[PDB]
Amino acid sequence: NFMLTQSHSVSESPGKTVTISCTRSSGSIASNYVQWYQQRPGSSPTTVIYEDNQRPSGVPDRFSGSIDSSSNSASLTISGLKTEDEADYYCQSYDSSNHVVFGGGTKLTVL
Amino acid sequence: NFMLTQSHSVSESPGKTVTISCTRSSGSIASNYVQWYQQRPGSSPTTVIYEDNQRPSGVPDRFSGSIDSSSNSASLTISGLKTEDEADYYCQSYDSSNHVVFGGGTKLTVL
Amino acid sequence: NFMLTQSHSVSESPGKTVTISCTRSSGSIASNYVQWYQQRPGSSPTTVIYEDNQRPSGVPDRFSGSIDSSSNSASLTISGLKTEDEADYYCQSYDSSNHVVFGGGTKLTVL
Structure with missing residues (x-):
């Protein structure tokens, strides 16, 4: 009964810190647990x-x-960015x- | 190469009604049919x-x-819950x- | 329609070779493709x-x-068995x- 809005894409250089947002409408x-999944190209999603x-x-x-109470969103932070971190990231949750x-x-693109 | 994520563990009383969901990432x-299987303890998957x-x-x-296309999900409803209904439920579909x-x-545990 | 009959539980040591049988009644x-799924404890079935x-x-x-035409059954062989190979294995097919x-x-039990 709600939407989870993320960022369309994010680029960054190796070794740096990235943070993806996931906002609930x-x-x-x-209110409900937030999961994050990684999907590397030509591979099935896995739970990160x-x-x-x-x-x-x-x-x-x-x-x-x-989870950021300030803006009603969950966030995924990657430190020491690596080339294998390049992939699609999906947040997921439940309603009541x-x-x-x-x-x-x-x-997420690693430059 | 997508994923099917279902409702988190559920508990309810006999004679009650429950609904387990399954959303496509x-x-x-x-695009493809969705199947549901009931898997009781130490047993093999059977179609419901x-x-x-x-x-x-x-x-x-x-x-x-x-099926609900607006949510891109699938649902299994079990009305008249019985104790023999206690099992793990899995949705399944096909890819390209x-x-x-x-x-x-x-x-699903029946109290 | 037809049912698939699998081998009685099997146990073998690490590094050895096991073969699981799936016979069609x-x-x-x-007549139809055969698939094998690995289901580790507390996990969902995954294709191998x-x-x-x-x-x-x-x-x-x-x-x-x-596919062993001499016995009318599919075969799942795992060489160089690993402890993490311990789980339930299921064969699945389709009908007309x-x-x-x-x-x-x-x-499958790895000793």
């Missing part, structure tokens, strides 16, 4: 962040999730009826 | 709904499938090449 | 083999499928009207 973005900021085993501590909503995705 | 949900809303002979009409794609699953 | 096991012997990118060449048929699954 209605209701507190903190779940439950707002928990990291599945394997995923380097370079990925970190946070347990429906699944995906953001439109954010293609 | 990208591409149109109505195929071709979006068809119940195979044997599956009671307590299970109902529907006709290869199978499974959702992460939804744990 | 009636009809040719080759599709279209009888094709491997999804990402899946190790340690997994290989085949392209309806999904799951095998009963085989528990």
Whole structure:
């Protein structure tokens, strides 16, 4: 029953810090758990962040999730940007009826 | 190469009504049929709904499938919850090449 | 329609070679593609083999499928077994009207 608005695309140079936003149109973005998925070209999506900021085993501590009460959005921050980090990133959450909503995705480019 | 993400674990009482959702990350949900499988503890996946809303002979009409293109999701409704209904539910569909794609699953426990 | 009969749970040591069988009750096991899914504990089914012997990118060449015309059954072989290969394996195919048929699954135990 709501939308999750992300950034269309983000570019950045290796070694730097990137932060992708995911804004919820209605209701507190903190009402339901926010997951983040990475989708490398020609590969299926994998979970990089779940439950707002928990990291599945394997995923380097370079990925970190946070929720910004200030602007009603979730955010994915990548530190020490690497070339393999290039891919599409999707945020996802639920509404009170347990429906699944995906953001439109954010293609991150490593220059 | 998309993903199917379903509702988070659900708990409810017998005789009650529940709905498990499954949203497609990208591409149109109505591009390919959506199937639902019930997987009871230590058992193999069996079909409760195929071709979006068809119940195979044997599956009671307590299970109902529907598709919502505006949300790009699919839904399984179980009315008249019984304890034997306790299982993991998985939605599934096909991609461009006709290869199978499974959702992460939804744990349903009948109180 | 037809049912798929899989091998009784199997256990083998690391580095050795296991072969799981999937037999079709009636009809040719080759009349329709056979797929194999790996389902690790608490996870959803993931493809290791599709279209009888094709491997999804990402899946190790340690997994290989085949169709044994001498026994009318599909075969899933895993060479150089790994501890992380422990899980349930399921074979699946279709019927005349392209309806999904799951095998009963085989528990693989790496000692």
